[PDB]
């Protein structure tokens, strides 16, 4: 199968291959959930990276890099995987005071795509100091290394996402916005971070509301119907026309259906990293009348031959509907480029480079020595190399400075669905290279979202609001 490749040194992987689309004695396996195409694309990216590494005779020569990809659920199953990774070849995990001489089944694990699952896995792995590079995880709590000694990353934290959002707001002069968060911890944390960041940059939030937890493809009670109509009515009543949404892509279906039903138009929606590059949400094509959609993503890096590789191709380690589900998504995924695929690619290559440096081989046979995970983690901090004309090195707080990009949703099946309109550089914390953006206004006039026209006594709590005298 494609979940297992034998090799001298294994490489664990945790990918969200399924999502809860709708008795504790029986455990619901991740197999029966609906297929998530993004997780399968990321798994294909990691497999392609491993195969490319094995192809080259200049990187890890004479040593076959294997991997053991397992399917982690969003939240459901995240203990068994790590137990399987840490056990020996006999599925037995010894317990001892010291783990220095202990060798596990895998030498490094490409972490999950969820902040909470990454936190749980890192808390489990802190004992063994197993190297773990996560992708598409933005929780700020993962930056400190006191409680996550063996955690790395290949994407900037939430601070850079919020900074890019605030810079975009400042460039187009919006000082009156509405923030919508989800009931889960990610949405609340991101909303609080945005509020703290924006309270000191002379931009005032009109109000903040929480969208109820709402998996699609399910029957929703009248209470949450009332909550949704109340939220949308408050949205339409307010004069702010810039809405920033911090919610997983699963929840927003019911909210967007509700606002479409309410016929509210003329707002600039700013998307978080979670649903900025959702193809299964962008395919709706009925949101074109809701205004302009923007989002904060990782720069698209064109990986040569990845699309061709994707097209040519124990328990909780097999999925059947993935290929058929992603077949219908081949065109849009090919056109949209690689944003988190590059993150997984770079994580796998960083692990390979760390292993190559640790083994100490130079374009010839390696020393084929025994490697302990803590040694690999120690050697993985100093990796520095050029990869697809990009520099990959880790900050002291375990982050990789990969440039962000503000992307705009356009609905043209013959062109790129997510068109880059701005570039954000985390190192200098500056947003530049802004290009032409197709607005929803009559002559492309930039949308006006200010709570008071420029004139002076203040009215209300917010400084941004006043009345001309």
């Amino acid at each position: 199968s494609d979940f297992y490749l034998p090799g001298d040194y294994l490489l664990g992987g945790l990918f969200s291959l399924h999502a809860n689309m709708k008795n504790f004695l029986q455990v619901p396996m991740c197999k029966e959930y609906e297929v998530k195409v993004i997780g399968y694309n990321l798994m294909q990216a990691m497999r392609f990276a491993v195969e490319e590494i094995n192809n080259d005779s200049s990187l890890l020569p004479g040593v076959l890099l294997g991997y053991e990809i397992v399917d982690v659920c969003y939240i459901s199953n995240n203990v068994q995987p790590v137990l399987y990774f840490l056990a020996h070849e006999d599925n037995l995990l010894p317990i001892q005071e010291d783990y220095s001489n202990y060798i596990s089944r895998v030498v490094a694990v490409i972490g999950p795509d969820n902040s909470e699952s990454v936190m749980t896995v890192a808390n489990f792995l802190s004992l063994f100091l197993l190297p773990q590079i996560t992708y598409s995880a933005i929780s700020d709590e993962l930056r400190d290394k006191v409680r996550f000694p063996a955690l790395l990353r290949t994407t900037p934290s939430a601070d850079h996402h919020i900074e890019a959002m605030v810079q975009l707001m400042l460039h187009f002069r919006w000082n009156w916005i509405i923030v919508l968060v989800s009931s889960d911890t990610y949405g609340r944390d991101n909303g609080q971070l945005l509020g703290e960041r924006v309270a000191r940059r002379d931009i005032c939030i009109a109000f903040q509301e929480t969208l109820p937890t709402l998996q699609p493809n399910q029957n929703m009670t009248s209470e949450e119907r009332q909550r949704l109509v109340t939220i949308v009515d408050k949205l339409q009543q307010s004069t702010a026309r810039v809405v920033v949404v911090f919610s997983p892509d699963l929840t927003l279906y019911h909210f967007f259906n509700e606002v479409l039903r309410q016929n509210f138009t003329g707002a600039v929606w700013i998307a978080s990293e979670s649903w900025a590059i959702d193809p299964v949400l962008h395919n709706l094509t009925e949101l074109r009348h809701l205004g302009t959609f923007l989002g904060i993503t990782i720069q698209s890096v064109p990986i040569p031959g990845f699309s061709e590789f994707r097209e040519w191709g124990t328990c909780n380690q097999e999925c059947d509907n993935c290929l058929n589900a992603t077949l219908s998504f081949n065109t849009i995924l090919r056109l949209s480029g690689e944003r988190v695929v590059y993150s997984v690619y770079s994580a796998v290559y960083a692990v390979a480079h760390a292993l190559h440096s640790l083994l100490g081989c130079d374009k010839s046979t390696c020393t084929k020595r025994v490697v302990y995970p803590w040694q690999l983690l120690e050697e993985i901090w100093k990796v520095n190399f050029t990869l697809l004309d990009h520099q990959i090195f880790f900050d002291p707080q375990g982050d990789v400075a990969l440039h962000l990009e503000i992307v705009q949703w356009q609905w043209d099946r013959s062109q790129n669905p997510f068109q880059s309109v701005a570039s954000y550089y985390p190192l200098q914390r500056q947003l530049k290279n802004i290009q032409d953006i197709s607005w929803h206004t009559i002559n492309n006039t930039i949308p006006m979202s200010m709570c008071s026209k420029r004139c002076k006594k203040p009215v209300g709590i917010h400084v941004c609001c006043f009345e001309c005298i």
């Binding site: 010291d98 803590w374 120690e378």
Partner: protein, 467 residues
């Protein structure tokens, strides 16, 4: 003193234990905590007393010995993660297999008495969820631990934060304060309290004028924003240190008196009451736990500490190396602690669940194979167990149900005394004719907004209107 030798006792169905016995790496080595914590040792002694008394009983678990394996956990999760792995290893073996599901496991401990810390309880509960090991925790009162989706085998003996936040919301609604400000600590506790109270208020009509966080020892900006709205009722769901820092700053800044709603964290803390000038900051109205206490715990602990010094008993008979070089005066201060009853009741609840699972009767227990830990979950939900003559029950969501007392700080000679003015039991009842308010006369402070009216929407949630 041979005190640490009592941390393990053999029996038919041994028990687990995670206690804060001690307090505080480029190699994968477990950290070692050498400093001694009195609260952890006292809680360990409380659970030991519970187990010993239960084994003394003939009606409960007849003919069977109940063991325990106490384990030292610091505030860190790394130190406490190993003991869980030891807990779920097979009996007689130090290796834990990586099976597909829970049904193939044979843990050596029937249950686990979870950690006191909330974040450590989160980690341990998430770990125990996979194996469906029934873990009951004391003092871990966060609300997200009640989600049965991710904690199918986590219980508790202390009320959750949701109960006290619902009591606070009902207090605001009954008194007519529908225009309030909500604050909380920058840590997990305050953030979760704010997240719960936002939904509770939105459901109950009250809405938040300003929702902010007070950083742990910025605060100037937080109270300035609180001033910017004319709100006379502020809910402070903060820990001891953050609340104390905010109160000290407001004492230095001479902020106007307001009706502060107090969480259980700083309502009873002497650090905040003893702050000079606190009497000039309005009434403090909080909800306090109404729970019993172990009457015989101090006698048991003093007689056991006296008995442990005798060499004969020790010869007749490490996890906590610093638990041996200790005097009674190092634990005498915290003898009258509430959490001891929580630990005792948790142990009693686990024993009662085991007794029900085996279908034992008064004379004895029927012969059968050992009961797996996951079999306890069926008889542990919706379970009524008696602890010291007072019945207790586990909700369908795994929380105990107990009452609350609405207390206010009554000032007399700059010595604040807590006074009972109300009682929350799911439906708040208050006696407002006795409450002594801080205004110029004895009139209830007014903090209400107009939701109907020219209208200018105001509030953090766009609720009210400025007619």
């Amino acid at each position: 003193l041979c005190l640490s030798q009592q941390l393990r006792m053999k029996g038919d169905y041994v028990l687990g234990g995670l206690f804060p016995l001690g307090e505080a790496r480029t190699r994968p080595s477990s950290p070692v905590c050498t400093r001694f914590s009195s609260n952890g040792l006292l809680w360990a002694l409380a659970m030991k007393m519970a187990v010993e008394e239960i084994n003394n009983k003939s009606d409960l678990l007849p003919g069977l010995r109940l063991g325990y394996d106490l384990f030292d956990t610091c505030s860190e999760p790394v130190v406490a993660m190993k003991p869980s792995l030891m807990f779920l290893a097979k009996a007689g073996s130090r290796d834990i297999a990586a099976y597909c599901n829970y049904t193939q496991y044979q843990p050596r401990v029937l249950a686990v008495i979870g950690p006191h810390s909330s974040e450590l309880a989160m980690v341990t509960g998430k770990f125990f969820s996979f194996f469906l090991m029934p873990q009951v925790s004391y003092g871990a009162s966060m609300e997200l631990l009640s989600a049965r989706e991710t904690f199918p085998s986590f219980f508790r003996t202390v009320p959750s934060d949701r109960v006290q936040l619902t009591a606070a919301a009902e207090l605001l609604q009954e008194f007519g304060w529908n225009w309030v400000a909500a604050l909380g600590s920058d840590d997990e506790y305050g953030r979760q309290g704010l997240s719960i109270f936002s939904a509770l208020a939105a459901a109950r009509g009250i809405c938040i004028a300003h929702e902010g966080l007070v950083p742990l020892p910025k605060v100037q900006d937080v109270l300035h924003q609180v001033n910017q709205s004319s709100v006379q009722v502020v809910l402070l769901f903060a820990s001891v240190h953050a609340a104390h820092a905010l109160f000290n700053y407001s004492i230095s800044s001479r902020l106007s008196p307001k009706v502060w709603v107090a969480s259980e964290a700083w309502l009873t803390s002497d650090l905040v009451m003893g702050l000079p000038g606190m009497a000039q900051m309005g009434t403090v109205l909080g909800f306090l736990q109404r729970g019993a206490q172990l009457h015989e715990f101090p006698q048991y602990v003093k007689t056991h500490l006296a008995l442990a010094t005798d060499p004969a008993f020790c010869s007749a008979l490490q996890r906590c190396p610093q638990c041996d070089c200790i005097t009674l005066q190092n634990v005498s201060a915290g003898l009258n602690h509430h959490q001891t009853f929580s630990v005792y009741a948790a142990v009693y609840s686990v024993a009662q669940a085991l007794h029900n699972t085996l279908q034992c009767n008064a004379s004895g227990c029927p012969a059968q194979d050992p009961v797996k830990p996951w079999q306890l979950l069926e008889n542990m939900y919706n379970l009524t167990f008696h602890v010291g003559g007072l019945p207790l029950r586990f909700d369908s969501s795994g929380n105990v149900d107990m009452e609350y007392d609405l207390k206010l700080w009554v000032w007399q000679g700059s010595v604040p005394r807590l006074h009972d003015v109300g009682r929350f039991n799911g439906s708040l009842r208050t006696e407002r004719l006795k409450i002594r308010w801080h205004t110029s006369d004895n009139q209830k402070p007014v903090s209400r907004c107009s939701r109907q009216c020219v209208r200018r929407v105001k509030g953090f949630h766009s609720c009210c209107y400025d007619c």
